[PDB]
Design a binder for this molecule. Structure first.
Ligand SMILES: OC[C@H]1O[C@H](OC[C@H]2O[C@H](OC[C@H]3O[C@@H](O)[C@@H](O)[C@@H](O)[C@@H]3O)[C@@H](O)[C@@H](O)[C@@H]2O)[C@@H](O)[C@@H](O)[C@@H]1O
Length: 110
């Protein structure tokens, strides 16, 4: 089941191994266009300490440059040691329409 987080205008939906989505909510409905940050492309897992990365590509065309959106996902230790499972921590956008999502998860903790 997909992880969700709202930051200002955009709500972000992370569907692990499928795609990443960005869209606007009003009340509790998706008002408008749904944008794709990217579709699942690759993943690397390392274990025994721990590391996990995924990449997502060919999302919606960027109006700034006409290039598809692209995203990478970092997976880091949930340092709150919480009890609600994984969560979207940050979304960063270091180049127009290129994103780095950071997910926190108890499974990546030492
Ligand atoms: O073009 C690259 C960016 O595209 C997308 O962001 C577009 C803008 O989104 C937000 O504004 C849209 C909404 O803002 C509201 O305040 C109202 O004005 C609405 O009518 C309007 O639809 C806002 O975040 C802007 O700063 C964005 O430019 C995203 O995909 C971005 O990640 C891209 O950078």
């Amino acid at each position: 089941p997909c992880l969700l987080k709202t930051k200002d205008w955009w709500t972000y939906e992370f569907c692990y191994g499928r795609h990443i989505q960005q869209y606007h909510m009003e009340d509790s409905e998706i008002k408008g266009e749904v944008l794709y940050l990217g579709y699942y492309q690759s993943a690397f897992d390392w274990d025994d300490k721990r590391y996990h990365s995924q990449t997502y590509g060919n999302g919606s065309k960027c109006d700034l440059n006409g290039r598809p959106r692209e995203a990478e996902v970092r997976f880091l230790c949930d340092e709150g040691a919480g009890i609600s499972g994984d969560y979207i921590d940050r979304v960063d956008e270091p180049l127009s329409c290129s994103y780095v999502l950071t997910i926190r998860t108890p499974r990546l903790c030492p």
